[PDB]
Amino acid sequence: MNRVLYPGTFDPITKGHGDLIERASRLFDHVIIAVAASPKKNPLFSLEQRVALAQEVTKHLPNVEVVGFSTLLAHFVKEQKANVFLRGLRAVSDFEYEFQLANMNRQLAPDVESMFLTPSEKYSFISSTLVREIAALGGDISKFVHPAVADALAERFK
Amino acid sequence: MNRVLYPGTFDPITKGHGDLIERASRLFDHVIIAVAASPKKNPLFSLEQRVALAQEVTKHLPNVEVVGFSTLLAHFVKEQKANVFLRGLRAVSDFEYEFQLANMNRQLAPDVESMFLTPSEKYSFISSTLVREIAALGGDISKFVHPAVADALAERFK
Amino acid sequence: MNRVLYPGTFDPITKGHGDLIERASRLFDHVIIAVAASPKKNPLFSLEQRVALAQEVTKHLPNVEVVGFSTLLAHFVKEQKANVFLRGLRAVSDFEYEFQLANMNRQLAPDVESMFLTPSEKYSFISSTLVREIAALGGDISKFVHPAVADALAERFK
Numbered sequence: 001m002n003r004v005l006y007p008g009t010f011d012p013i014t015k016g017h018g019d020l021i022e023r024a025s026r027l028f029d030h031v032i033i034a035v036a037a038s039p040k041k042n043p044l045f046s047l048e049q050r051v052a053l054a055q056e057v058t059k060h061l062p063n064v065e066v067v068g069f070s071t072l073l074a075h076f077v078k079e080q081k082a083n084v085f086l087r088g089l090r091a092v093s094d095f096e097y098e099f100q101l102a103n104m105n106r107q108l109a110p111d112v113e114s115m116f117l118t119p120s121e122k123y124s125f126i127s128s129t130l131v132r133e134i135a136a137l138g139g140d141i142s143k144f145v146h147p148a149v150a151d152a153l154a155e156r157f158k
Numbered sequence: 159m160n161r162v163l164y165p166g167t168f169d170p171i172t173k174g175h176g177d178l179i180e181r182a183s184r185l186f187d188h189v190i191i192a193v194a195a196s197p198k199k200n201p202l203f204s205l206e207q208r209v210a211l212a213q214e215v216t217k218h219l220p221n222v223e224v225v226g227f228s229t230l231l232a233h234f235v236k237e238q239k240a241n242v243f244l245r246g247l248r249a250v251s252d253f254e255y256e257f258q259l260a261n262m263n264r265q266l267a268p269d270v271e272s273m274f275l276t277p278s279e280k281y282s283f284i285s286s287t288l289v290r291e292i293a294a295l296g297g298d299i300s301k302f303v304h305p306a307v308a309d310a311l312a313e314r315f316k
Numbered sequence: 317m318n319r320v321l322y323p324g325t326f327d328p329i330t331k332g333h334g335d336l337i338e339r340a341s342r343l344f345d346h347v348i349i350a351v352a353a354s355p356k357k358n359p360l361f362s363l364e365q366r367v368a369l370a371q372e373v374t375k376h377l378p379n380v381e382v383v384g385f386s387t388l389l390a391h392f393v394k395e396q397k398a399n400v401f402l403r404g405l406r407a408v409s410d411f412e413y414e415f416q417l418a419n420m421n422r423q424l425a426p427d428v429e430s431m432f433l434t435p436s437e438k439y440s441f442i443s444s445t446l447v448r449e450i451a452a453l454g455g456d457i458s459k460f461v462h463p464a465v466a467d468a469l470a471e472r473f474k
């Protein structure tokens with residue numbers, strides 16, 4: 001059996017992440033979305049909000065579950081007994097921080113594989129930072145994110 | 159007529175920008191330098207100062223106008239009725255980012271073209287960030303910027 | 317004689333820099349590890365702590381000495397009378413930033429050469445930032461740093 005763990009800040013989750021999750025839920029028996037606290041990033045949404053938004057966006061996929069965590073990813077992946085890390089690779093960078101992330105996690109969790117997917121072309125170039133900045137200036141982001149996310153961002157900047 | 163809009167933070171405008179603007183005024187009938195507030199960047203100079211510096215550096219160019227804006231670029235370009243985005247490309251450098259930026263603005267402003275110029279060999283490798291940091295440590299920055307900008311940098315840290 | 321200066325924040329110094337330093341001490345008569353204050357990065361360790369960790373890690377190399385500084389690199393290098401800048405490329409970070417750095421320093425210190433080494437494959441993916449983050453979450457970092465650094469990181473986070 002394969003259990004893949006998709007770790008990220010998801011602030012917020014976008015159509016880019018969702019495409020990747022869609023594809024991964026058809027490949028693997030179990031997909032865990034691991035939302036990291038990432039306090040250093042000063043996230044726009046709270047961990048609970050990010051987990052909840054990610055849950056809403058994935059509610060239709062039976063083998064996908066969402067959980068938040070504040071610990072070391074290499075510890076958390078053993079705790080989840082997942083044998084595969086999922087990360088998305090868009091163009092291009094980083095990427096190289098992803099190569100660096102994978103090689104450092106290989107030392108800390110040797111039995112976990114690091115694997116990459118690339119999003120549909122249509123949802124590449126979608127970045128959570130840019131979704132946030134467009135929303136904060138009142139731009140329409142409905143083509144970059146799910147409607148609950150769009151609503152959450154709109155209400156957030158009021 | 160083409161009305162080209164060149165949007166940046168310009169903190170401060172450098173000889174790299176100035177080169178691009180010289181080149182852009184020779185290609186297009188109307189060039190608007192759109193100086194972004196960019197509060198996330200915590201600019202060294204105020205928007206009002208950054209606009210005054212850009213005005214000073216381009217006042218000799220009759221088809222070039224400068225304005226500050228704090229709104230969504232995709233909204234502001236319509237209020238300005240420009241049909242072309244100008245951006246500069248240097249060493250890699252923030253080049254992925256220009257594709258992603260262009261991609262997302264093509265969704266938000268479908269009718270506006272996105273185009274790129276490159277500055278002379280001589281003004282590549284000039285970053286407004288390194289100019290700020292060198293000046294803040296009392297390094298001589300006069301060879302990276304126009305003289306009014308050099309004075310403002312000197313006065314900025316006294 | 318060649319006197320090479322190796323500047324960085326070294327927060328903290330890793331086996332990644334130590335490999336570069338080892339290689340440099342066998343090429344040059346004199347190697348200076350220049351630790352930058354870098355107040356903006358808000359370093360985990362104080363300047364004085366980072367200088368001490370760097371001394372501990374290199375004290376077995378007689379031609380290598382460590383010093384801290386808070387001034388402009390281009391002036392400090394004149395103070396140390398070094399004619400060579402050493403910079404490492406922690407794999408493929410942004411050699412374009414190192415270029416922008418080198419050519420701007422070419423303007424401020426024309427008599428100093430910029431030179432680059434790459435670390436052994438084994439240490440080319442160690443990031444002091446990620447070491448700080450793994451250590452802060454109680455992860456084992458003994459495979460990325462010298463034992464004094466591991467001890468120092470351990471004491472820093474309980």
Ligand SMILES: CC(=O)SCCNC(=O)CCNC(=O)[C@H](O)C(C)(C)COP(=O)(O)OP(=O)(O)OC[C@H]1O[C@@H](n2cnc3c(N)ncnc32)[C@H](O)[C@@H]1OP(=O)(O)O
Nearest residue numbers: 007008009010036072073074088104105127128129449450
């Ligand atoms: C060696 C190690 O163990 S690392 C030690 C430090 N920390 C930890 O262990 C705690 C765990 N931390 C994490 O899991 C984090 O998710 C990290 C460190 C893996 C990566 O940070 P992320 O949350 O993925 O955000 P990311 O680095 O991708 O930057 C956010 C951007 O990437 C996108 N993004 C966010 N999360 C992801 C993701 N999981 N996968 C792909 N893309 C993502 C967003 O669209 C966003 O767009 P932007 O570039 O304009 O901002």
Ligand SMILES: CC(=O)SCCNC(=O)CCNC(=O)[C@H](O)C(C)(C)COP(=O)(O)OP(=O)(O)OC[C@H]1O[C@@H](n2cnc3c(N)ncnc32)[C@H](O)[C@@H]1OP(=O)(O)O
Nearest residue numbers: 133134165166167168194230231245246262285286287288
């Ligand atoms: C979807 C989107 O378009 S964003 C939606 C939300 N935000 C907005 O709408 C705000 C609208 N304004 C903007 O987004 C800003 O103008 C931006 C990001 C397009 C431009 O910001 P920038 O000026 O490029 O800041 P940035 O630091 O990234 O500049 C990169 C480098 O190129 C130089 N530079 C500054 N402005 C420009 C410019 N317009 N073009 C080319 N180079 C520039 C600088 O010297 C800078 O050097 P540095 O990185 O060492 O500081």
Ligand SMILES: CC(=O)SCCNC(=O)CCNC(=O)[C@H](O)C(C)(C)COP(=O)(O)OP(=O)(O)OC[C@H]1O[C@@H](n2cnc3c(N)ncnc32)[C@H](O)[C@@H]1OP(=O)(O)O
Nearest residue numbers: 291292323324325326352388389390403404405443444445
């Ligand atoms: C040089 C000029 O005058 S331009 C103005 C800039 N600054 C000054 O004048 C003051 C002097 N400042 C310095 O010397 C600084 O060290 C700098 C800006 C030149 C370099 O900063 P860095 O120490 O490389 O820090 P960086 O932002 O890359 O982050 C530290 C990382 O760099 C790595 N690192 C630090 N120094 C080096 C180095 N000399 N070579 C290769 N890698 C390095 C570490 O692996 C660490 O890993 P990380 O990216 O995961 O955190």
